[PDB]
Scaffold this active site. Structure first.
Site, PDB file in Angstrom:
ATOM      1  N   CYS B  95      54.787   5.827 -33.723  1.00  0.00           N
ATOM      2  CA  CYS B  95      54.672   4.574 -34.458  1.00  0.00           C
ATOM      3  C   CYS B  95      55.485   4.527 -35.726  1.00  0.00           C
ATOM      4  O   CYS B  95      55.746   3.475 -36.253  1.00  0.00           O
ATOM      5  CB  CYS B  95      53.217   4.355 -34.910  1.00  0.00           C
ATOM      6  SG  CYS B  95      52.089   4.284 -33.531  1.00  0.00           S
ATOM      7  N   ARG B 223      46.966 -15.320 -33.527  1.00  0.00           N
ATOM      8  CA  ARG B 223      45.922 -16.247 -33.113  1.00  0.00           C
ATOM      9  C   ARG B 223      45.422 -16.961 -34.361  1.00  0.00           C
ATOM     10  O   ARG B 223      44.381 -16.604 -34.930  1.00  0.00           O
ATOM     11  CB  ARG B 223      44.798 -15.492 -32.404  1.00  0.00           C
ATOM     12  CG  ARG B 223      45.197 -14.984 -31.036  1.00  0.00           C
ATOM     13  CD  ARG B 223      44.117 -14.117 -30.433  1.00  0.00           C
ATOM     14  NE  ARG B 223      43.058 -14.996 -29.933  1.00  0.00           N
ATOM     15  CZ  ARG B 223      42.618 -15.052 -28.674  1.00  0.00           C
ATOM     16  NH1 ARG B 223      43.080 -14.230 -27.733  1.00  0.00           N
ATOM     17  NH2 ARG B 223      41.665 -15.929 -28.361  1.00  0.00           N
ATOM     18  N   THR B 226      41.767 -18.108 -35.145  1.00  0.00           N
ATOM     19  CA  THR B 226      40.746 -17.083 -35.189  1.00  0.00           C
ATOM     20  C   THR B 226      39.732 -17.402 -36.271  1.00  0.00           C
ATOM     21  O   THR B 226      40.091 -17.843 -37.343  1.00  0.00           O
ATOM     22  CB  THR B 226      41.364 -15.696 -35.507  1.00  0.00           C
ATOM     23  OG1 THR B 226      42.171 -15.281 -34.411  1.00  0.00           O
ATOM     24  CG2 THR B 226      40.290 -14.639 -35.784  1.00  0.00           C
ATOM     25  N   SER B 250      45.491  -3.556 -33.459  1.00  0.00           N
ATOM     26  CA  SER B 250      46.795  -4.099 -33.304  1.00  0.00           C
ATOM     27  C   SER B 250      46.977  -4.464 -31.865  1.00  0.00           C
ATOM     28  O   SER B 250      46.423  -3.846 -30.992  1.00  0.00           O
ATOM     29  CB  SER B 250      47.894  -3.115 -33.712  1.00  0.00           C
ATOM     30  OG  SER B 250      47.711  -1.870 -33.085  1.00  0.00           O
ATOM     31  N   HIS B 351      51.984  -4.686 -32.342  1.00  0.00           N
ATOM     32  CA  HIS B 351      52.570  -3.390 -32.737  1.00  0.00           C
ATOM     33  C   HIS B 351      53.441  -2.804 -31.612  1.00  0.00           C
ATOM     34  O   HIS B 351      52.998  -1.948 -30.881  1.00  0.00           O
ATOM     35  CB  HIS B 351      51.464  -2.438 -33.153  1.00  0.00           C
ATOM     36  CG  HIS B 351      51.938  -1.077 -33.498  1.00  0.00           C
ATOM     37  ND1 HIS B 351      53.185  -0.825 -34.018  1.00  0.00           N
ATOM     38  CD2 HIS B 351      51.324   0.124 -33.394  1.00  0.00           C
ATOM     39  CE1 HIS B 351      53.339   0.476 -34.167  1.00  0.00           C
ATOM     40  NE2 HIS B 351      52.225   1.070 -33.794  1.00  0.00           N
ATOM     41  N   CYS B 381      50.954   4.970 -39.934  1.00  0.00           N
ATOM     42  CA  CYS B 381      50.354   6.151 -39.365  1.00  0.00           C
ATOM     43  C   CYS B 381      51.030   6.419 -38.077  1.00  0.00           C
ATOM     44  O   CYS B 381      51.631   5.532 -37.477  1.00  0.00           O
ATOM     45  CB  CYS B 381      48.852   5.973 -39.154  1.00  0.00           C
ATOM     46  SG  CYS B 381      48.370   4.686 -38.008  1.00  0.00           S
ATOM     47  N   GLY B 383      50.590   8.475 -34.341  1.00  0.00           N
ATOM     48  CA  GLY B 383      49.784   9.222 -33.387  1.00  0.00           C
ATOM     49  C   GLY B 383      50.208  10.642 -33.322  1.00  0.00           C
ATOM     50  O   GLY B 383      51.386  10.930 -33.424  1.00  0.00           O
TER      51      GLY B 383
HETATM   52  C1  COA Z   1      42.407  -3.279 -27.933  1.00  0.00           C
HETATM   53  C2  COA Z   1      43.235  -3.440 -26.646  1.00  0.00           C
HETATM   54  C3  COA Z   1      42.797  -2.438 -25.564  1.00  0.00           C
HETATM   55  C4  COA Z   1      42.954  -4.827 -26.108  1.00  0.00           C
HETATM   56  O1  COA Z   1      43.760  -5.073 -24.929  1.00  0.00           O
HETATM   57  P1  COA Z   1      43.478  -6.517 -24.218  1.00  0.00           P
HETATM   58  O2  COA Z   1      42.030  -6.659 -23.877  1.00  0.00           O
HETATM   59  O3  COA Z   1      44.551  -6.775 -22.982  1.00  0.00           O
HETATM   60  O4  COA Z   1      43.904  -7.542 -25.428  1.00  0.00           O
HETATM   61  P2  COA Z   1      43.636  -9.106 -25.315  1.00  0.00           P
HETATM   62  O5  COA Z   1      44.655  -9.923 -26.013  1.00  0.00           O
HETATM   63  O6  COA Z   1      43.633  -9.382 -23.700  1.00  0.00           O
HETATM   64  O7  COA Z   1      42.115  -9.422 -25.845  1.00  0.00           O
HETATM   65  C5  COA Z   1      40.953  -9.102 -25.046  1.00  0.00           C
HETATM   66  C6  COA Z   1      39.857 -10.148 -25.287  1.00  0.00           C
HETATM   67  O8  COA Z   1      39.535 -10.256 -26.687  1.00  0.00           O
HETATM   68  C7  COA Z   1      39.798 -11.611 -27.117  1.00  0.00           C
HETATM   69  N1  COA Z   1      40.432 -11.684 -28.447  1.00  0.00           N
HETATM   70  C8  COA Z   1      41.357 -10.894 -28.970  1.00  0.00           C
HETATM   71  N2  COA Z   1      41.620 -11.374 -30.178  1.00  0.00           N
HETATM   72  C9  COA Z   1      40.873 -12.455 -30.404  1.00  0.00           C
HETATM   73  C10 COA Z   1      40.763 -13.297 -31.449  1.00  0.00           C
HETATM   74  N3  COA Z   1      41.516 -13.076 -32.531  1.00  0.00           N
HETATM   75  N4  COA Z   1      39.912 -14.333 -31.423  1.00  0.00           N
HETATM   76  C11 COA Z   1      39.139 -14.545 -30.283  1.00  0.00           C
HETATM   77  N5  COA Z   1      39.279 -13.660 -29.216  1.00  0.00           N
HETATM   78  C12 COA Z   1      40.140 -12.641 -29.310  1.00  0.00           C
HETATM   79  C13 COA Z   1      40.762 -12.189 -26.131  1.00  0.00           C
HETATM   80  O9  COA Z   1      40.568 -13.616 -26.087  1.00  0.00           O
HETATM   81  C14 COA Z   1      40.338 -11.533 -24.860  1.00  0.00           C
HETATM   82  O10 COA Z   1      39.241 -12.251 -24.326  1.00  0.00           O
HETATM   83  P3  COA Z   1      39.358 -12.855 -22.855  1.00  0.00           P
HETATM   84  O11 COA Z   1      39.047 -11.588 -21.897  1.00  0.00           O
HETATM   85  O12 COA Z   1      38.093 -13.881 -22.787  1.00  0.00           O
HETATM   86  O13 COA Z   1      40.664 -13.512 -22.589  1.00  0.00           O
HETATM   87  C15 COA Z   1      44.771  -3.306 -26.915  1.00  0.00           C
HETATM   88  O14 COA Z   1      45.283  -4.403 -27.703  1.00  0.00           O
HETATM   89  C16 COA Z   1      45.108  -2.016 -27.646  1.00  0.00           C
HETATM   90  O15 COA Z   1      44.902  -0.933 -27.113  1.00  0.00           O
HETATM   91  N6  COA Z   1      45.692  -2.171 -28.848  1.00  0.00           N
HETATM   92  C17 COA Z   1      46.091  -1.027 -29.701  1.00  0.00           C
HETATM   93  C18 COA Z   1      47.273  -0.296 -29.061  1.00  0.00           C
HETATM   94  C19 COA Z   1      47.527   0.980 -29.841  1.00  0.00           C
HETATM   95  O16 COA Z   1      46.653   1.849 -29.897  1.00  0.00           O
HETATM   96  N7  COA Z   1      48.708   1.042 -30.460  1.00  0.00           N
HETATM   97  C20 COA Z   1      49.105   2.189 -31.239  1.00  0.00           C
HETATM   98  C21 COA Z   1      48.331   2.086 -32.526  1.00  0.00           C
HETATM   99  S1  COA Z   1      48.206   3.740 -33.139  1.00  0.00           S
END
Ligand code: COA
Ligand code: COA
Lengths: 393, 395
Positions: B95, B223, B226, B250, B351, B381, B383
């Site tokens: 990252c 979003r 939100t 993120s 991200h 940060c 990983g």
């Molecule tokens: C957390 C994570 C697993 C979510 O993946 P995901 O579920 O495909 O992400 P989505 O955009 O589909 O959101 C999932 C649900 O939460 C809801 N949601 C997310 N943000 C929202 C918001 N701001 N307001 C309302 N709902 C929200 C979405 O609407 C969705 O709901 P739905 O199933 O009814 O459509 C993924 O984003 C992740 O792993 N992120 C971090 C990645 C990482 O670790 N990067 C390196 C950092 S060190």
């Protein structure tokens, strides 16, 4: 002339035996192999892990589920402090040299005193990749289990297999099929003689395999004859020069070179084996990428204020016999001083590992011969070359 | 002593970044190479930097996600008209990669091996492949072969066997950060992104991309409708009663940036227009189990080397990998929230692993100048247990 800003010394240099594709090291990750070389280097130089301020690893093709963490996991595995950072770099076949370059740079800007600079590749573990299936498929589409290794050996910018860039050089430099096979035989013979005389003993980091100790390069074919080579068919081009007998082998392996500032050598009572006197990286035409070592070696020498005649040993990675021969003819290299103990045609070319092995071999062979200077180099897919010059201590 | 200046003056002469695309979104058909190319082309044009002046190309990219990935930096260099003699390096400090390419560039400049360096960062997470392992050399009847999700498995650090999100939960526990505090931070990132976007604060950095024809020039993951109530209803994704949800982590995303840096000698020779000077940087390792804390020793070390304090920073950026992770950094350094992640971050716009450091740097360069400020520091940060920080000074 441009001298390194600070003195930089090689205080340890080790490399694994190289395994054949699907051979004895196939179940070790690139991370594992790098670990084994790094542990052996730390031990051979009596370098405490605590002294290491930076970890830099070359690795080309990500080939394990933990690959993106490679350098960090190696550092932590061998007991280097958690505060020490860890970087993975990719300059393709030049990667094992490039980690040393990056290390020299960090030392020279005083951001590090001691750097673990490795190179590794597990080509046996290169995955098949399924692309374009996350978001739906279309009935009738042709989805592949894409061979990540094989597709990586074509430069898509010019749409040429690496081997075809080498054929381009064979045509350009008037290198015959027969000349290529003779060079290939010589690499096998030279590897065999060196191996049997013990010339790989100091660099070798043995690995316990499923239990036996592996400490001999697996790819080498010391019973090779010119007749056998002559019968092989060209693999990539009709009446081409490149065969399975005179190209580098696909292989698994790693190396580790520990470098230190002059201040660190004195502070920790390290034993320097060599000094890094210079290096250079150049781009070149991608269609004849195999020529990279020419501007790389020329530039490095110029910066060091040396000439080719000052080199006691030259190494040009044996990516393909015709590729090596084009370099040899362009620089007018002395064959009695070049790839003296064989190379990648005999012992294989683990992409990220070869630069580390070549450097490690030069360090120990230069000392064995009582020579003063050596230069190691590789061509780089995509159209680059890299060269590193050492001086005996 | 602790003070250390760059050996030579290093100036940012261009800084651009692509809009960030959602996972499976508008940029899903562009490779990490393509995205880097778009940012690099835009940077060359915005800085009026002739490609012929570029002596080195260095690109951060974490997860190889295309059949041409191992060639990424080289292909980008060639595609944007930089001479074939110019070398090209791809680096991976996870990252931190988009910051790290700038660090490497600074080093090459400072040892006089380069005068002008194209330093980019890019990621296509939409293109991360499924990998089939262990089938080259035969299978065993009864073995469990997977179509492994390279992206998902890469988000667990196998050395400590923790998902990235769990390292963030470790920090939430350690620093007493509540679920509610995390969601409030997440809401604030969305709000700050929206306000910035609508006020034009991403215009100067933005490198628009034509998509299937429309011009994409707005971050897709954000979003802006939100609400806290929406966030409150989301379940924790990784830990029972945990702080981390899909709303306060993120996003997975696609995007890239490009920062062109130049020695003082090059700026004068080529009449470049510097936007910023690189004052300092630092990379530190930290405990992998709480990798999210990396920005603390990274920012502290960079400031120490530069002879500066946190109070001198007009802007601070801490990549928003997870709300609780960011908040643990905020509390450890006592960051001023009115000067930290002022226009949103990765919770809102996503991200793209290799791309974020480039975007953050680019954003700092332009936002510092907009504010009339003097210093800024960007950090992430990493990983595996690292942190990186880069300090800039307005010119
Ligand atoms: C957390 C994570 C697993 C979510 O993946 P995901 O579920 O495909 O992400 P989505 O955009 O589909 O959101 C999932 C649900 O939460 C809801 N949601 C997310 N943000 C929202 C918001 N701001 N307001 C309302 N709902 C929200 C979405 O609407 C969705 O709901 P739905 O199933 O009814 O459509 C993924 O984003 C992740 O792993 N992120 C971090 C990645 C990482 O670790 N990067 C390196 C950092 S060190
Ligand atoms: C050329 C290449 C495709 C061959 O791979 P491969 O077919 O798995 O290689 P093999 O070891 O299986 O050899 C194939 C045949 O040649 C024969 N052969 C190879 N070397 C021989 C030798 N030295 N003496 C006698 N026979 C030999 C093998 O025995 C085999 O014949 P057989 O199947 O009838 O027994 C592969 O080695 C390659 O592409 N290498 C270069 C990799 C590269 O591009 N790296 C980057 C460089 S920039």
């Amino acid at each position: 002339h441009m001298a390194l800003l600070r003195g930089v010394f090689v205080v340890a240099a080790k490399r694994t035996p190289f395994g054949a594709y699907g051979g004895l090291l196939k179940d070790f990750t690139a991370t594992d192999l790098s670990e084994f070389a790094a542990k052996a280097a730390l031990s051979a130089g009596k370098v405490s892990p605590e002294t290491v301020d930076s970890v830099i690893m070359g690795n080309v093709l990500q080939s394990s589920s933990d690959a993106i963490y490679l350098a960090r996991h190696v550092g932590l595995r061998v007991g280097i402090p958690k505060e020490t950072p860890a970087l993975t770099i990719n300059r393709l076949c030049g990667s094992g040299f490039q980690s040393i370059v990056n290390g020299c740079q960090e030392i020279c800007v005083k951001e590090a005193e001691v750097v673990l600079c490795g190179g590794t590749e597990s080509m046996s573990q290169a995955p098949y990749c399924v692309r374009n299936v996350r978001f739906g498929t279309k009935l009738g589409s042709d989805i592949k289990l894409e061979d990540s290794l094989w597709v990586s050996l074509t430069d898509q910018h010019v749409q040429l297999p690496m081997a075809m860039t080498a054929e381009n050089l064979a045509v350009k430099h008037k290198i015959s099929r027969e000349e290529c096979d003779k060079y290939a035989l010589q690499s096998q013979q030279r590897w065999k003689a060196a191996n049997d005389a013990g010339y790989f003993n100091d660099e070798m980091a043995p690995i316990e395999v499923k239990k036996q100790t592996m400490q001999v390069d697996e790819h080498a074919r010391p019973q090779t004859t010119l007749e056998q080579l002559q019968k092989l068919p060209p693999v990539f081009k009709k009446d081409g020069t490149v065969t399975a007998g005179n190209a580098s082998g696909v292989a698994d392996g790693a190396g580790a070179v520990i470098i230190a500032s002059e201040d660190a050598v004195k502070k920790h009572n390290f034993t320097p084996l060599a000094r890094i006197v210079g290096y250079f990286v150049s781009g070149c035409d991608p269609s004849i990428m195999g020529i990279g070592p020419v501007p790389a070696i020329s530039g490095a020498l110029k910066k060091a204020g040396l000439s080719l005649k000052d080199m006691d040993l030259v190494e040009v990675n044996e990516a393909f016999a015709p590729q090596y021969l084009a370099v040899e003819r362009s620089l007018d290299l002395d064959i009695s001083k070049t790839n003296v103990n064989g190379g990648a045609i005999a012992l294989g070319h683990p992409l990220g590992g070869s630069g580390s092995r070549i450097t490690a071999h030069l360090v120990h062979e230069l000392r064995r011969r009582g020579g003063k200077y050596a230069v190691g180099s590789a061509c780089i897919g995509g159209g680059q070359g890299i060269a590193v010059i050492i001086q005996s201590t």
